[PDB]
Amino acid sequence: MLQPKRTKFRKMHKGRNRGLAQGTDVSFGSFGLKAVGRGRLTARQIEAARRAMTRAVKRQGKIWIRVFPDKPITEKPLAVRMGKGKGNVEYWVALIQPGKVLYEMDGVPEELAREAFKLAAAKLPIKTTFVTKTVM
Amino acid sequence: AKKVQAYVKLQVAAGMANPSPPVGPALGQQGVNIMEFCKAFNAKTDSIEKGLPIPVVITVYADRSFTFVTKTPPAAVLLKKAAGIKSGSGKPNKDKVGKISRAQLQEIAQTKAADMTGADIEAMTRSIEGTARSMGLVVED
Amino acid sequence: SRVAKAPVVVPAGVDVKINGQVITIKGKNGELTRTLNDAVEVKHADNTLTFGPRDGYADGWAQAGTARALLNSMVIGVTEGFTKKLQLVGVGYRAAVKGNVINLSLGFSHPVDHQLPAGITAECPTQTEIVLKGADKQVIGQVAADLRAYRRPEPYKGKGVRYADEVVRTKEAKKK
Amino acid sequence: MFTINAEVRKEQGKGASRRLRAANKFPAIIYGGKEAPLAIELDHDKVMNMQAKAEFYSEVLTIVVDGKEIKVKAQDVQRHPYKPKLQHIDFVRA
Amino acid sequence: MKVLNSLRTAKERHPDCQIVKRKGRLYVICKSNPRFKAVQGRKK
RNA sequence: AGCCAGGAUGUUGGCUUAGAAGCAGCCAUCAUUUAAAGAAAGCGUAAUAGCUCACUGGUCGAGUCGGCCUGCGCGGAAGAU
Ligand SMILES: [Mg+2]
Ligand SMILES: [Mg+2]
How many CB atoms lie within 10 A of CB E20? Predict the structure, then answer.
């Protein structure tokens, strides 16, 4: 499960998820899986989706993961009074804005990359689309 | 040729002419009198040899039993006796289970100018080899 | 559409009355009558029947393409007539003809009877062979569902009433 | 070898360009050499398909603008953030 | 027959599948092998 | 898309080979008579088996196919006087 090894601080203001994405072209492979909807990816979701593509391609083809949790999510457990301090870190998320290239792939034919990245889309909480390397 | 009246083939290398444990009923469940297996087979298979596995045809008539005709040994069984290992494939092209050659093969392919679909001497040289290749073979003529 | 573009032939004997959207086509074996959908144009003259659309009705080509396959079948039925074929399979199964009543004994405590509709009559050669003869095609398939629905084909012994164009696939009696 | 038909822009800034894309067109620009930049407006569907063959990004294209001809090369491109379209393109009078 | 709200996996299992409309919903017949029979929906 | 049939051979491909012949397996993915034809996707299990099938040929005669930019609507959609 991906997670920052260390961070300066345990806990983080909620913040927002405004604006558009920076990762919008396929920058390492030949094909890519791109985020369309807006939202937060948990580390467990990213791992479940990463598995789907690796099942499908055997031990062939290389995969890059362009997003990284980085943001800690806290929660107060059951039966707790409000106030009394910020929750305990339970899992880690990455903030995703539309256009972020999430996954890339190269080493399989385009037809198989679409199938392989697709057997992943059912694991993600935001709509996605298949994108390709582009000249310039 | 003509239409089907049940003719296939069920047996291994000529170690038994009429065997109980090997095939069983499956060769005499139709009209095959298990007696002709040795009373026709020996009555005729003491003419080429009684030691390579040969697949034959089967002809059952409304009268008594059947007459089968043989013709050529299988291409794959030929490799166990004089080409490589004891059984054949097993672990094919992972390692290099041998080095036969086009020469050893041809003498048991050209001699099949009727039961070996092919009006080309050359074809048999590589066609019989087609059977002999999956067992991981480097051809070194 | 492509059905619709090919008109229908009317040989001799045929009658063709076209009161707007009512049709009566008669020949040597009936007086078949049908109310035509509004959104259609079966035209006359020549020796044909073109099936086109009418301006102001949406579908139209699906509607006039249906009249093609309908009047097509009608013209055949008033000349040559239609014949289905239910062959009986499954022991203790009777079939005999007492006029226009079909005698069925298909394993039940009560021999089922079936009264035949208008022009769809029928008969039997034996106790396992039924053969119907009629004019309408919408009705012979209908009689064939009634006669067939009584005892449907069980898929383990292929028993019951079956079409003669019928494929009775079977499966194995479980395992162990 | 590809020839693009363009009209000169009468406005500029975010409003017109979002209005252009709202009008199924999109802006682009021609700069380079000694002469001044040339603000242009393009038909969207035509250039999307052109640039879908690598030849677009390495050949000298011809822009036809008010029935004249400016020889340029594609230099940079802004693509839609996540849809298959285009927001803007740079051409250089090279 | 099962329901499910997604016929993308129904229409490919056996070749004899085609998808029709029928009533308000969207059914997936197979009178060839009646095992592969899907519906898409509830009622009122 | 219908439909005529063809869909023949190396070949039980050898194979941990209980029958494994495509056909519950191990792997391999050759090359044969060619308009075609896999050591084979499937009904199947005593095993061929049988027929559709992947592929072409004869026929049919002006269109077929479904992905983009999108407007609108269908399924998903069960609670208690
Ligand atoms: Mg504003
Ligand atoms: Mg209803």
Answer: 8
Experimental method: X-ray
Closest CA to D42 of D53, D62, D28, D52: D28
CA-CA distance, C173 to B6, in Å (whole number)? 26
Size of interface A-D (CB pairs under 8 A): 22
Covered bases, chain F (protein CB within 7 Å)? 8-17, 19-21, 26-34, 39, 43-50, 64, 68-70, 74-78
CATH topology of domain A21-136: Aldehyde Oxidoreductase; domain 3 (3.90.1170)
Classify residue B107 by burial, with Cβ atoms within 10 Å: 0-12, 13-18, 19+.
exposed
B114 touches strand F (CB under 7 A): no
Domain that holds residue C63: 8-80
Under a CB-based contact definition with an 8 Å cutoff, are residues C67 and C42 in contact? yes
C49 C-beta neighbours (distance < 10 Å), count: 23
Distance CA C8, CA C51 (A): 9
Q: The CATH number of the domain where D5 resides is what?
A: 2.40.240.10
Residue located via tokens 């009429």: B18
> Are E18 and E31 a contacting pair, CB within 8 Å?
no
Domains defined along chain B, listed by start:
1-71 (3.30.1550.10), 72-141 (1.10.10.250)
| Dihedral (Cα; C55, C58, C62, C66), 10-degree rounding | -60
CA atoms within a 13 Å half-sphere pointing along the CA-CB vector of D68: 7
Query: Domain tally for chain D?
Result: 1
